[PDB]
Structures are given as structure tokens and as C-alpha cells.
Design a protein around this ligand. Sequence first.
Ligand SMILES: Nc1ncnc2c1ncn2[C@@H]1O[C@H](COP(=O)(O)OP(=O)(O)O)[C@@H](O)[C@H]1O
Ligand code: BEF
Ligand SMILES: [Mg+2]
Lengths: 73, 91, 78, 14, 641, 93
Amino acid sequence: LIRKLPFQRLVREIAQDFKTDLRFQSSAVMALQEASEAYLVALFEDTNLCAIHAKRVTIMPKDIQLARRIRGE
Amino acid sequence: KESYAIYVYKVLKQVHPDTGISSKAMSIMNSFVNDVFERIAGEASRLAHYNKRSTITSREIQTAVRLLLPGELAKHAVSEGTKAVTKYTSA
Amino acid sequence: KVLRDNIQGITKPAIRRLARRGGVKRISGLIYEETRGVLKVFLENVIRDAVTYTEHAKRKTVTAMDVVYALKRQGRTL
Amino acid sequence: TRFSNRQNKTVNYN
Amino acid sequence: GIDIVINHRLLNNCKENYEFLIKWTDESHLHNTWETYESIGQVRGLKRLDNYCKQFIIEDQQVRLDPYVTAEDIEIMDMERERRLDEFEEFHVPERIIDSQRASLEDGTSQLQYLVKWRRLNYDEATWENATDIVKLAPEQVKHFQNRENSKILPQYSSNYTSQRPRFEKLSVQPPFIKGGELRDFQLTGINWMAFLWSKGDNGILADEMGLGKTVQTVAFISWLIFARRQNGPHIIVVPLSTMPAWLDTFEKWAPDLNCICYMGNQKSRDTIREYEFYTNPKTMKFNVLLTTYEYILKDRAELGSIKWQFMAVDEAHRLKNAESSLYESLNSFKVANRMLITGTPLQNNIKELAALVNFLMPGRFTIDQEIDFENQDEEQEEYIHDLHRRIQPFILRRLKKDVEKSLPSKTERILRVELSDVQTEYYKNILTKNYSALTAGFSLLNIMNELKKASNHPYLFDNAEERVLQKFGDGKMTRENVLRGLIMSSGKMVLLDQLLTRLKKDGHRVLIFSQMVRMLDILGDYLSIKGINFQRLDGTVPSAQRRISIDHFNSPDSNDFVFLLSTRAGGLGINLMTADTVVIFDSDWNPQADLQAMARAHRIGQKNHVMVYRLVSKDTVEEEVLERARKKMILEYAII
Amino acid sequence: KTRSSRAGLQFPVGRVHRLLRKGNYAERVGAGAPVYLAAVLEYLTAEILELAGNAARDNKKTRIIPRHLQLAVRNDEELNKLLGRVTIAQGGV
DNA sequence: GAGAATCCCGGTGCCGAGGCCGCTCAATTGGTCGTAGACAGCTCTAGCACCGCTTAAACGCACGTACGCGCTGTCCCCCGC
DNA sequence: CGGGGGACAGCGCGTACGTGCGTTTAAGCGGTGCTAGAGCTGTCTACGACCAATTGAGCGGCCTCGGCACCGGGATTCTC
Ligand SMILES: Nc1ncnc2c1ncn2[C@@H]1O[C@H](COP(=O)(O)OP(=O)(O)O)[C@@H](O)[C@H]1O
Ligand code: BEF
Ligand SMILES: [Mg+2]
């Protein structure tokens, strides 16, 4: 769903912050895509539950913050 | 290399020989097998240490699985383990 | 060529698709920047530990197995 | 032949 | 629906007053008419008129209001105008009729429409238009269409040959099928030797030198085998994109009566080609020969693989390097009675590539294997390479212009050793030294060779270098001339080549620039434009039509654009630039044969005069090592000869 | 006959018996434990594979694929709640 | 403004914390033996960078409506005693 | 049990979001080409494990003293 080239360029940027010189297996990039997609989708399902509890059709950033606090923190 | 795919194939043919399996699914089964194994083993070890025991036996695993596993799956699996070890020991 | 991809690479249509997969009906236009931040944090959390795994192997290259170790423990907690 | 012990809900996955 | 206007003629003034040469979504280019905003009213696609209104506004702004726009920029605008309008007029001339049908009109009458394709244009536009105009505008095209409808050169007219192969031997007569010129002994002997090889039954390689006639030779041979060997069943010619028009032009001059096609474009284009052009009564396929590019094979791999091909021909056949190439796979999923591989140099790099080629010709028939391989000197490998040489020699044709036609004047070739700038020295050191702060000042060390090589051609390939350079100049930013200086000073090669270019400018010499690096060819494009030079660029990004017409114009003798700038990967192959006397290379590749190909782009049957060739080599930097490895690769060529 | 076939089991009792040492889980291991372990391993995989086979069969596919596994895993609440933190690569929602 | 609740101050009890002493077990010291790890070298492959080409996706703008927000009024419940 | 406040519903208005359309842009795929490090193998030496003896500290029990908590009274502070 999410685009491997942008995604992996982001990944390498962040890695470059910690190490400053890396190599990556493409399988590692794939795994990071799968993980990030699954995590984000779960968080979306949560935040939607929040939005409907607040009787909105639109989700709001407040719903993201709340969901992340309650589940994640 | 040290992998179960042949055993997966055995039980696959034993459970649904009309179904093939993707290598991806096969690898997922291998990852799954390793995960459940390390889960039960790590628990049984720590239980044995708690019991001050240097040895692991059927009881430890039989207890650990009843701890890990959902209630139906537990007593079904427990019965399968006891049946199997009965056959093994009676042989 | 002035823009930088790390933020931009994750972009309105893909976020929309993720939301639709998440069953969301409608979204405020503000949401995307929250999620990018959250994504960065999530990504940042995992990759740091993958780096340290790679350090303990003293290897330059990061494998999917290192990712699996970091993602295994971190994912279960989160 | 590897029979299943549990009695569980029937599912349609199609 | 609305389609976007050819031309405009006489902001609210712009909207009310003016008139535009519309086109419509279902009507061919000849249905263009002058229309006005209120006369059309609201119609589907009016945003195109809005776009053209915006364009016309900015045209007025650039042509008339901006005081800076120089006279030569107005002349370039007039060129853009007249060149595009002439190309619209070419879209207003048919190129092909595909089929004919009579259809009922709303008046209850009926009319005979010809499915018409148009010049510079393809089967996305092509549509049924009443023959009443076709018959008067291009009766030649009507005649050719009536020929192409009826050639009986079609798959159903030929058998499964492989069971039998009659002999052939060399001949000394001009091919009678050919309208396009006059073969000499070498082209004819091409025809002869290919016919003999076919008559052994075999698949062959043509490697007489680059630009020496292969295209005309191969069309003459395919014509011979169609006529002589009744090879009426489809032949597939796979061609590098840029040369597909020239191959067409070859047919359109050398055997214009043949029923052959080029296969390209969007799925709609390719579908309409398949159904209308290929299929009869959907199957049997109307064409005798299909041109394709490599990727358009993959675009229809199994579909075209369903045809019983009688002949495969392959330009730049080193495009097939190894068995695992997706192309090599697809071409061996295809089945064919004959294969012929064309390249003015038979191997780029290594014995394994030639092994894969000969396996593609005759799989497993040649005992060529790593167990004897190219140790730089070895009696056993040198014996076996001469054994392979004599084994292959019946199956390769090779000559130089030195053999073929001493009339063709030779090439000067020279290396231009040049010093680093201070900027070059700094950055190169800052790659030899590992300075993450220097990277942070303008960011990866993960390929040091590439970083230092591209730096070594130009530090402006790091974007912060232009800022920090022109700011340490301080005046550099301030004016075009100060920018020009602050740029050109930054590499010694740039200074030298600027001197040489100024000399050629005084000479009136016509010159080709080549590089591996598209960003460098951009920096050089900007340098040329700020220097006020007239030139064209070519690289793999420009689509077919603009690149084609760019080549055509530059080959036109009146072309004031005296410089052509080219990528190697796209521009170095297949093309003839006979208007250019001189060639320069900023950087050799790992592979020498690519450089020989670039040279061939100048060096051709059509070259009028002795050519001159220069290589810009930085002093004490890795390219010398690259050059020595490329020379070792050339030693492999010298060993196989 | 081999320990597995003696138990009727279709898994490498010798491997896991070795692995119980190789993983340091205990310096001693009792002979039934690897057998009992193998029995429950076989049972567990059979239950999931049966559901996944239905999933492939229902999707008219012979190939069991991550989608079919994921669909099975999420349909049983017990497996799903057992596997609530397991994530299936290329297993869609 | 008045009353109720909260805080501060002082005394006393009660127990726990802190210290001391003696004994036992663990920790330390020294020696022996082997294997695991470290080091070095070689070969293989996968990872990195860039170009060529197609096409689909993404972006930007305009148009429309629907949803969200705020306001108002009524009613029930929960809070407080 | 009584009273007051919050909750809920309905209505109006404006803006934001969604959809359509066209054009631009970068991804996706294939190929080019090379080098680095990945992994494997072999060898040697250091380090820990094991065993034995000795010594000192820690643990356990007991005693004494001080700190903390609770209770009562008065003054301060908040709330209606
Ligand atoms: N038989 C011929 N007579 C005259 N000119 C020729 C002949 N063959 C080729 N040429 C010239 O060569 C040019 C084509 O180069 P070509 O040989 O087709 O490249 P290649 O064969 O290397 O692909 C044409 O412009 C044409 O003028
Ligand atoms: F293919 Be030729 F050398 F132009
Ligand atoms: Mg050619």
C-alpha cells in the first residue's frame, strides 16, 4: 500500500542519524513496511472508534492523541 | 536448514492434502512453530527454576501448556500429550 | 530541487488508503501531520534497536533477522 | 487424518 | 468533446476577443476549425481552452511585455511556434490507412471511411475518416494501403522449414528488391554471407563495423529471404527505441512496398494495432514484419510469442548479455526458424557474454565454458580462444572501414590530461579523508568510487557547492557573467573545453558532447545557454517525437545549433550525426565498446570529413585505472580476432 | 522403531530433545518431555492448518497462502487472542 | 458575613530501626587443563548507484454539499444531606 | 428527598472535505557495473572452569533509643 522507494529513503535517513553509515537487506525494508502498515492500520481502527464515540464522521487529531495515549502509553 | 517444512508437508498432507502451501506460508508456519516452542520452553524452564528443579519433565510442560494455552486447546492438547506419551512409554 | 522526501514520501493519497483500510469514513485535513510524526516515532523506536543489534554483530549491514528481533519485543510491548 | 479434537464454529472464508 | 487547439488568433479581452483553431475528441486533425468562446459555449474539456488561454496570456507576456527577453529568445519562440505548427500540419497529413468500411449516417445515407493513421502520430489518434479527403491528399498512401491490404506476405503462406535447408553461396549482384540506394561489395557480401549461413540452417552474427550499412543490409537480406526463401511468415525486428524511425525510414526508402509495422505506445495504441493491424477476421496477421523495442516485447510477451515467427533480428544485440536477462528469457520463450544478431562489436566485456550469444544462436553446440577462460596470458586459454575463433569464424561477419571503404576518412583520437581545480582537490581529498562535517556542509559514503568520480567531473554535483563557491566569490551570484566564470573555473576540464569550444566556435566546427552523467549534461546545457550557444540535448528522458525531430534538425545542414550534447546510455547508440566533425567524451565508462559506439555515432557511411575525438582525463585520478581496465577488455577483443 | 514413530508423532523428537539442551532451558530433560512437547506441537499446527485449508478451499485455491492463514487465525477468537500480537507478513486485514 | 472544614502545634506511646556479637558459610586464592574464541585469509554475492522507459499515481484547482459546531430549551438524575 | 445542573435534541450556518479533471512527476522495472563485507575455515593462545584451602564478612539474634503517628485544641480559609 505504501511506496517502497519513499519509505526506504526515509528509513535510511533515520538510520543515517544513528549510525551515519549503513547497508540494508531489502527484506529488512519489506519487514519495516509490513510492521508500519499493520501498526498504522490498528491505530486508525482505534482512532475511528474514538471518533464515532465522539459522534463525528471525521476523525480528529485529538482522537489520534487520545488513542495513542490510552493504548500506546 | 534446521527447518520443519518437511514435517509441515507431512501434517499438511495429513490434514489437507488437497491444499498446497506458498513458501511464504510455509515460512510463517516455521516462524510460528519456533515462536510457540520458545514460549512453552522458556516458561517451563522458569517454572522449573522456581521449583528449584534442574530437570524438566512431562508435568512441567503439561503445567506450562495449561498456563499458556486457551482452555479448550489446553485440555485437548493435554489429552493429546498424555495419550502420546502413554503410547511412547507403553511401547 | 528543494523538498526532502522523508516527510513527503508519506503522502495524502497513501494515508487516505491506509485510513480506508482502517475503515475510516472521513478525515480532518490536519490528521496527516500527526500520523507522520507518530510514524517517525514508531519507526525511530524500532530502528535504533536494530542498529544496536547490528553493532553487537559488529557488521555494517542490517539484516531482516535483526529487524525481527527489534520488532518482535517492541511490537509485543506496543 | 490428523483429526481435530476441538468442536468449533464453522466458517466460510470464500 | 474538446481537444486542444492548433493555433490562436483574434484578461477579459483575451476571453472575449480571440479565436482558436480547435480540435475535437472524435475528429481527426484535419477536422480543425477556427472557433470562439461564445460560439462553442460550455463544452466538455473547456479547461483545455482555459489552459491555452493561460498559455496565450503568458505568451503575450513573454513575447511582448517582458523587456529583458532577447531577440534570439524571440527567435527561439518563433521557432517553437513554426516548428510545432508545421508538426500539426504533419498531423494534418495521413501516413497510413489501416482498413476501409462503409457506414450509415444519420441522414440514412452511407459513406466509405478509411481508418487513417497520421504522420508523426500513431493509432491512438487514427480513426475512420471519409476517404473523400484521403484520396486527394495522399493517393500515394491510398496506393500503398491497397498494396498493404494485399501483399499475401502473411503467416499462412509459409511452412515449417526446419526439416530442410538448401545451400547458398556468395553472389556479386545488386539486390533487385531495393529502391533505397546502392549496395557496395561489402553490403552485398553481408547479404551473401547471411544467406549462406541461413543455408547451412544457422543463426548468425553481423559485426562489420558500426554505421557500416547493417540496417540497409539487414533489410536487403530480409527482403531476399522473403522473396528468395518465401519467408512470408512474420519476422520480428527488435530495435533500440531511438532508431525505430530510421529502421522504418529504411523500409520506407529501401523496400517501401513491404507490409511492415512498428509496435509501440499505450495499451490502447497496442490493442488497436493488434486488432486492426495484426488481426484478420478475429487469427492471421496482416503484416510481414514487426518492429518492436525490447520492452514492448515484455509488454506482450505471450501474445507475440503465440505467433510462429520465421525470423528474429536484433539490433545492438549486446543488449542480450546473459541468459538470465528478462529479454533473453522472453526471446527463448519465443520460437523462431532463424536468428540474426547485429552489432558492430560482438562482445563488450567477457567471454561469458559471447558464450551466451552463441548459445542463443545454437544452444549448447559450442564447447565454450569457464573451464578454459581468459587468463591474461595462458597457452591453454590462448590455444582455446584461437580454437573458438576458428570454430565461430564461419558464423561471424566482421570488417572495418579500413577494409571496407578507404574513402571514409579516419578519426583523430586523443586524451586530454587536465588538472584538478582547488574545488576538485578539496572535494576529492574530502572523499579520501572521511569528513562527515564536509558531507554535512555538502551526505553518503556508501559508494566512494561514484562519489569521487562524479565530484572529479564536477563539484556542482553537490548542490551546496554552487552556493558556497559563488558566495566565496561573492560577485559570482551577482551577474550572469560572474556566474559563468564561477562555474567554468571550478573544473580544469571545463576551462580547457571552454577554450576548445571557443576555438571551434571561431572555426565553425560541429561537435558532439558525451557524458555518462545526466546532471553534468544539465550543467553543461546551462553553461551553453548562458554562453549563448545554439545546441540540442539528447538523453533517455526526451520522448520519441521531440528526440527524433531534434536529431533531424541537427542533421539538417542549416541547423545553427552547432553543438549536440548527448548521454551515452541513450545517445551513444545507433544514431548517425553526420553534421558533426568532432566528438568529446567527459568520462569513459568501464566498457570501451560503448565509447567505440559513441564514436560510431559520428563515424559512419555518411561522415563527409575526417573526424577528431578527445577524452577529458583528470590528472592522477581513477579514470586512468578505468581506462586501463577498459583497455584490458579491448585486449580480449584483440585476442578473439 | 524411532521415538516419533513409537509415539506415532510426525516431528523430530531427537531435534527438540537436543534443542532442549541446546537452548539451556535445563541441564536435565526427562524423556517424556520432548515427546509430550512434540505431541502438542503436532496438535496445535493441525488445528490452524485445518482452518487455513478451509480458507484456501473456500477461496477456491489449492495453495494455502498468508491471506488464508491470516483469515483462519483471525476467525478463531482463541487462536486470534492467542496470536493477538503475531503479525502476518502479506496477511491482509 | 458566617459557618464549616482544614491546618498547625504539642504531648505521649509504641514499635521499629540501628548497632553489636559470634558463628558458619561463602568468598578468595592458587593451580591445572582444554576449548572456545579470536585472528587471518579467501571467495563469493549481494548491496549500492545510475540510466531508460512506461505508465500510473499524485498534485492542484474548482465546485458542491454535508457535516460539524454552537445555541437554546427541556427533563431527568445524582448529588448532597 | 429535593433541587439544580448537566445532558440531550433540534435547528441554522458556514466551512471544509470530497469529488472530478487535467497535467505533471516520480515510482517500478530492468540493466550496468563494482566493491565491500559476509561468511567460512584454520590455527593458536588465553581464560575460565574446576578443585582445594583458608579467612573474613555477612547473617541472625538481641537490645536500646529515637522517630513517627495519633489525638486534642485553636486559628485560618474557603464556600455559600
Ligand atoms: N548501400 C548504401 N548506400 C548508400 N548509403 C548507405 C548504404 N547503407 C548505409 N548507408 C548510409 O548509412 C546510414 C545508415 O547507417 P546504418 O549502416 O544503417 O547503421 P547500422 O547499419 O550500423 O545500424 C544511412 O544514413 C545511409 O545514408
Ligand atoms: F548500429 Be550501427 F553501428 F549504427
Ligand atoms: Mg543498428
